[PDB]
Amino acid sequence: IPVIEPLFTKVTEDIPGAEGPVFDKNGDFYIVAPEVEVNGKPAGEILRIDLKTGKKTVICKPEVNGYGGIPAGCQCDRDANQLFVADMRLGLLVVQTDGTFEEIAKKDSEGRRMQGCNDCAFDYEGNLWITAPAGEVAPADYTRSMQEKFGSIYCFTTDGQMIQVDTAFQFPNGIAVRHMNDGRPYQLIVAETPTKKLWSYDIKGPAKIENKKVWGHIPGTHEGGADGMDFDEDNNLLVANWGSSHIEVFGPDGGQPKMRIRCPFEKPSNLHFKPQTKTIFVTEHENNAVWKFEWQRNGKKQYCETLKFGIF
């Protein structure tokens, strides 16, 4: 299995649990710090990073009814410059670039209390696929599915329904949507961290998935596994393999990695491409920092990069 060692450049540091790297419609860069605490209680933050200096700015410190958040994953919206944030304590939030935020839902379409979320990914139709490795949100005592299988997957549809699409996962983490060349959503890829597996489903429509299958295998016996992921323009899937010092590269068909990228740190957590470039920003938990490196090709366009009123 070929392994490459590109040059990694430090961007910023001292960000507890550095996660959810994302770019907004204006090109601004954000990351979340889920592990920030205050007096032993969660006090996670959402930060904006100046890429020219590495200087940080906390734009939001989510809290609902006195319960602080654990923001861990992000996606930028298309029709509005706003961020969708998966929070391990608060569920799903919508955060404005000015710092104001709104809680999306306390319960799902079946009336069941929402579970804490970790990452999310939009499909080109505007539906948001979310992983939920935590137990019930906020007032409820914080729990996580690292040992027991209670992790779930949700779909937040364009018509505003929060539907649980599957459950019984052991820490569902990263998530990605594979699209056809015509732009139609085709498959959902979900990372199940401690089991060293990537799972796939065929997407038949909003909140409609079928044919669950083992899609890929994550190497190593180390503690950890697949965390965050994203596709490149050729539909290669790059997967942060937390605890292995590598980012695995899977081909469109999955299976075993076709290549591995060696990182100068043991805990890569999540990644994101800079729009219209081959530059990938990576967060890691060894140093709680953000780095960047050049890939072989550009990233796959994110939903926020597509056009609602586009001809082609």
Instruction: Give the nearer residue to Ca ion in terms of CB position, either 87 or 230.
Output: 230
State the Cα–Cα distance between residues 208 and 65, nearest whole angstrom: 33
CB of 174 to Ca ion, least distance (A): 6
In one letter, which amino acid is 48?
R
Rounded to an integer, what distance in angstroms lies between the CA atom of residue 93 and that of residue 101?
Answer: 7
- Residue from 12, 173, 245, 288 touching Ca ion (CB under 5 A): that is 173
Report the 10 Å Cβ neighbour count for 170.
18
How far apart are the C-alpha atoms of 125 and 147, rounded to whole Å? Answer: 34
Q: In terms of CB distance, is 272 or 292 closer to Ca ion?
A: 272
The answer to whether residues 48 and 59 touch, using CB atoms and an 8 Å cutoff, is: yes
Residues 157, 112: Cα–Cα separation, whole Å? 17
Which span (94-102, 108-116, 203-211, 221-229) binds Ca ion, by CB under 5 A? 221-229
What region does 90 belong to: left with phi over 0, alpha with psi -120 to 50, or beta? alpha
Q: Does 272 bind Ca ion (CB under 5 A)?
A: yes
Residue 84 beta carbon to Ca ion: minimum distance, rounded to whole angstroms? 12
Q: Which of the stretches 6-14, 45-53, 227-235, 280-288 binds Ca ion when contact is defined by CB under 5 A?
A: 227-235
Judge whether 128 and 119 are in contact, CB under 8 Å: no
Of residues 230 and 248, the one with the C-beta less far from Ca ion: 230
Q: CB of 19: closest distance to Ca ion in angstroms?
A: 6
Residue 285 engages Ca ion in binding (rule: CB under 5 A): no
Piece in contact with Ca ion (CB under 5 A), picked from 49-57, 151-159, 245-253, 272-280: 272-280
Tell me, yes or no, if 179 is annotated catalytic: no
- Is 230 one of the binding residues for Ca ion (CB under 5 A)? yes
Most distant CA pair in the chain: distance in Å? 54
- Residue 142 CB, shortest distance to Ca ion, in Å, is 16
Q: How far is the C-alpha of 194 from the C-alpha of 169, rounded, in Å?
A: 10
Q: Which of 217, 222, 246, 285 is catalytic?
A: 285
Pull the structure tokens for residue 123: 């499909």
Does 136 interact with Ca ion (rule: CB under 5 A)? no
Site residues, Ca ion (CB under 5 A): 118-119, 173, 227, 230, 272
Catalytic residues: 285
